[PDB]
Design a protein around this motif. Structure first.
Motif, PDB file in Angstrom:
ATOM      1  N   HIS A  39      27.497  86.188 -21.866  1.00 37.21           N
ATOM      2  CA  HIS A  39      28.375  86.688 -20.806  1.00 37.21           C
ATOM      3  C   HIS A  39      29.426  87.773 -21.398  1.00 37.21           C
ATOM      4  O   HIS A  39      30.688  87.062 -21.786  1.00 37.21           O
ATOM      5  CB  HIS A  39      29.214  85.330 -20.470  1.00 37.21           C
ATOM      6  CG  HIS A  39      28.409  84.334 -19.747  1.00 37.21           C
ATOM      7  ND1 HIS A  39      28.048  83.084 -20.551  1.00 37.21           N
ATOM      8  CD2 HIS A  39      27.442  84.336 -18.906  1.00 37.21           C
ATOM      9  CE1 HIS A  39      27.104  82.466 -19.806  1.00 37.21           C
ATOM     10  NE2 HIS A  39      26.693  83.074 -18.512  1.00 37.21           N
ATOM     11  N   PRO A  40      29.113  88.783 -21.564  1.00 39.64           N
ATOM     12  CA  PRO A  40      30.262  89.866 -22.066  1.00 39.64           C
ATOM     13  C   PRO A  40      31.280  89.942 -21.239  1.00 39.64           C
ATOM     14  O   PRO A  40      31.769  90.594 -20.380  1.00 39.64           O
ATOM     15  CB  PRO A  40      29.494  91.404 -21.687  1.00 39.64           C
ATOM     16  CG  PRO A  40      27.989  90.899 -21.485  1.00 39.64           C
ATOM     17  CD  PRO A  40      27.825  89.479 -20.912  1.00 39.64           C
ATOM     18  N   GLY A  41      32.291  89.221 -21.813  1.00 40.06           N
ATOM     19  CA  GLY A  41      33.578  88.972 -21.341  1.00 40.06           C
ATOM     20  C   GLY A  41      34.740  88.983 -22.693  1.00 40.06           C
ATOM     21  O   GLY A  41      35.661  90.124 -22.349  1.00 40.06           O
ATOM     22  N   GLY A  42      34.577  88.509 -23.535  1.00 42.40           N
ATOM     23  CA  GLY A  42      35.422  88.492 -24.641  1.00 42.40           C
ATOM     24  C   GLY A  42      34.800  87.758 -25.767  1.00 42.40           C
ATOM     25  O   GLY A  42      35.435  87.314 -26.495  1.00 42.40           O
ATOM     26  N   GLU A  43      33.334  87.882 -26.166  1.00 41.28           N
ATOM     27  CA  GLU A  43      32.871  87.239 -27.306  1.00 41.28           C
ATOM     28  C   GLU A  43      33.068  85.716 -26.942  1.00 41.28           C
ATOM     29  O   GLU A  43      32.346  84.902 -26.636  1.00 41.28           O
ATOM     30  CB  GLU A  43      33.445  88.101 -28.468  1.00 41.28           C
ATOM     31  CG  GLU A  43      32.912  89.535 -28.410  1.00 41.28           C
ATOM     32  CD  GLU A  43      34.126  90.410 -28.937  1.00 41.28           C
ATOM     33  OE1 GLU A  43      34.992  90.645 -28.287  1.00 41.28           O
ATOM     34  OE2 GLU A  43      33.874  90.776 -30.243  1.00 41.28           O
ATOM     35  N   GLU A  44      34.260  85.299 -27.954  1.00 33.77           N
ATOM     36  CA  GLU A  44      34.567  84.109 -27.964  1.00 33.77           C
ATOM     37  C   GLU A  44      35.324  83.597 -26.808  1.00 33.77           C
ATOM     38  O   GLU A  44      36.745  83.926 -26.632  1.00 33.77           O
ATOM     39  CB  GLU A  44      35.417  83.673 -29.064  1.00 33.77           C
ATOM     40  CG  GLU A  44      36.484  84.483 -29.377  1.00 33.77           C
ATOM     41  CD  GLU A  44      36.643  85.429 -30.585  1.00 33.77           C
ATOM     42  OE1 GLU A  44      35.852  86.403 -30.437  1.00 33.77           O
ATOM     43  OE2 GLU A  44      37.280  85.149 -31.588  1.00 33.77           O
TER      44      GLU A  44
END
Length: 94
Positions: A39-44
């Protein structure tokens, strides 16, 4: 041994570079390297950037769709309780 190894806090608190995020739920270390590129959003994004008292009862399904076994196969072991939130000295007194 092949069931949850006692990792360390310096080994978990040192993933600023490289890949594979090492998030933690309560006492388990998560190497969610497969979720970081899912989910490309903020890695962690497993509840561990702006605090918020752990991840509540568990992971929320607000922006999740395959929430069934993501908090299991994305794990590697646990953390040494000696480094967790417990620097007391129980016993060894009486």
């Amino acid at each position: 041994d092949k069931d949850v190894k006692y990792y360390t806090l310096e080994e978990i608190q040192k993933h600023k570079d490289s890949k594979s995020t090492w998030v933690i739920l309560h006492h388990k270390v998560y190497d969610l390297t497969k979720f970081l590129e899912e989910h490309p959003g903020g890695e962690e994004v497993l509840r561990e950037q702006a605090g918020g008292d752990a991840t509540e009862n568990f992971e929320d399904v607000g922006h999740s769709t395959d929430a069934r076994e993501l908090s299991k196969t994305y794990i590697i072991g646990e953390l040494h309780p000696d480094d967790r939130s417990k620097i007391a000295k129980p016993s060894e007194t009486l």
